[PDB]
Task: structure prediction
Amino acid sequence: GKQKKTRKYATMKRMDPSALKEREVPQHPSCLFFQYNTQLGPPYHILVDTNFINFSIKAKLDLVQSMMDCLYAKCIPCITDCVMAEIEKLGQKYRVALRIAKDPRFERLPCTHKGTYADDCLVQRVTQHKCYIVATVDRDLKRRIRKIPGVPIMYISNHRYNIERMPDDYGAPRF
Amino acid sequence: LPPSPGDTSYYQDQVDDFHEARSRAALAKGAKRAITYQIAKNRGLTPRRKKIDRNPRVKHREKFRRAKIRRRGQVREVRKEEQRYSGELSGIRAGVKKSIKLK
Amino acid sequence: TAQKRPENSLLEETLHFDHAVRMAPVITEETTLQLEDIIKQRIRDQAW
Amino acid sequence: QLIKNGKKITAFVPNDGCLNFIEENDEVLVAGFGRKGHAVGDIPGVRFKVVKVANVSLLALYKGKKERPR
Amino acid sequence: KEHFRAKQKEEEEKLKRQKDLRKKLFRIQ
Amino acid sequence: MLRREARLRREYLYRKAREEAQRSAQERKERLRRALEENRLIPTELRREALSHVDDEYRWAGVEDPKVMITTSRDPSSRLKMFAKELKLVFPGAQRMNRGRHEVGALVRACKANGVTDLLVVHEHRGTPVGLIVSHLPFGPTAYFTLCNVVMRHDIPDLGTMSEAKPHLITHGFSSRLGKRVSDILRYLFPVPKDDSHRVITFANQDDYISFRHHVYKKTDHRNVELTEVGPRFELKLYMIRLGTLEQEATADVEWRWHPYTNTARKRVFLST
Amino acid sequence: PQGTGFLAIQSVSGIMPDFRIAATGVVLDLDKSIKIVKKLKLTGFPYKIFKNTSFIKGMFNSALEVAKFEGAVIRTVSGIRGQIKKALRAPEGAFRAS
Ligand SMILES: [Mg+2]
Ligand SMILES: [Mg+2]
Ligand SMILES: [Mg+2]
Ligand SMILES: [Mg+2]
Ligand SMILES: [Mg+2]
Ligand SMILES: [Zn+2]
Result:
């Protein structure tokens, strides 16, 4: 369809000594013990990407239940305004994903950005706070997150959820 | 459009530039026989290792001690006011900004 | 060194050593005959 | 030359100086090599290595822990 | 200087297999 | 002419530099390609490296005859004066000039002013010629030779007089790129001959030693030709080529030089492949 | 015959506390000539220096000695490589080297 054609078109276009010395050097976060995140706690806040929701529907996986199976802990999925906007732009064909996203257990958090691009918004939140887990199946987004220290990545492998850089994985699939 | 008058290419072509670059680089450059301990334990050519490697528990103890030293470069350790405040004991830098921007 | 050795001792010792460069060629009649044969052929073929 | 089938193959000796322990017409044990790949400075197309001579491991002979029986 | 060398060592490791080395040399050719 | 000559030199060196760069690129591509096609092994140094044919100075060889000047070192010996006299007869149209208290740079400026194409200088040791320098005057290359086995016509009695006609040229044994470069310098010293000329001058390369032979042939009958050797006989060994004139040792670059202290210098040759 | 082992002892008489077997090996080859060689270095010192060319004394004691070794490869302790060129006249063994 031309929805497919417009999508591939969009993705193609996507790619003196007296003066005081001043410089912005952000401080290393105190939460991290080298590469280990100590303040990441058993209540996990997980930032869900838009394509993560759709592939969970294809794999017949409930969102909250499958995350609990992976971690054996209480998990709080989080939805940004950027991600919610992209689901709405998909249309009536993706109405099932839209209903799932508006779930009272989910955490609805605001964002005041310029633009709707949700990969940029999710990277910015990761840089600021270091308390989230990122759940996505997008490959280039996962490459960007891997450059940021102390942030685990949740993804779908076979018909189960999997986690990437988390020491307290416990009930996670083996290879 | 021609370049700026101060530029050397304003009055030099590629031939002059080739020769001047070479010249600039050159100028800028200027009754019982018991067996011995060696026989009893045929150690042979075994790599020599430090005494710390002998005990794995104390080897891990030194690794933790060094790791806290290396962490001091990244992050500042919390300390109490066990003496009356008398200054920083180092400089106060006024141009370095460590805050995290929220956007 | 030369002090420890007797006079002219190495002429009978037959030691082994390395020569630095290739020696100059020696001229003989056989080389002359071979070289003139090359000239004669090119005269016959008119190859200049 | 393998005793079982008579084929002639080329194998690696692990280290130079283990060649001194091996003589001609000796009996050696051969294992596979190179399924993972070939390192820098290794000749491609050789898929075997020498492990034992006279049922003694080459590392034990090299380290001076055992002597080769004749 | 040591930091610069260690970065190149990772690239040297990033093609240390025999087939990997022959891979680029056809590609650079 | 100080300003004009400097401009022509710079553009000549500029064009020469570009030609060398593009040829060096070809060798790196060629040597890299043949190595993998063999598939034998990859040298580690090869891994580190991977990760206007006609010479510019010889515009005017065919249009006009060359003009050759021959001189010697200061205070020449008796036999050196004979050798320079014989070389004049070998080269058609050559001239021989007395070297008095003439500065080397003063000779070059006079030769350039009067349109002399090439300049030859010969040295001697105990009355036997030992060195020869060939210079192409309009900022052409300078080649340095050493002489090995010199036999003069003056030594040989009752030879007579030579034909002095324009001779045919034979070049043999020069196969490498340097050998092609060397044979060009020797060949352009001579004018274009006639088809019916019976004078032959030969340059034969054998293990980096060049033999000079001079002959005249007569055809008594078909398929049989008789050779009578005339003229001087000597060997040449190149050891240096410089881009500038012989007034420019201290500034000219070295195109090629012989390195005898190299670990493999003994078993290597450069004029043949 | 080749391929037979052998054993080395220093003294069969007397008793010593230590291990008495000195060495072990195998027989490889039989011949009538040994062909074994030893390294011999002839040493000299410079006494007159002209840039690359230097005059060397002490290596030889006569002009006949230098003539036999003309063109031979020589080097310094520092690693600079050279060549023998000709024999001089005033010291009997001195020669010229580049
Ligand atoms: Mg996206
Ligand atoms: Mg223990
Ligand atoms: Mg005079
Ligand atoms: Mg003189
Ligand atoms: Mg005067
Ligand atoms: Zn946003």
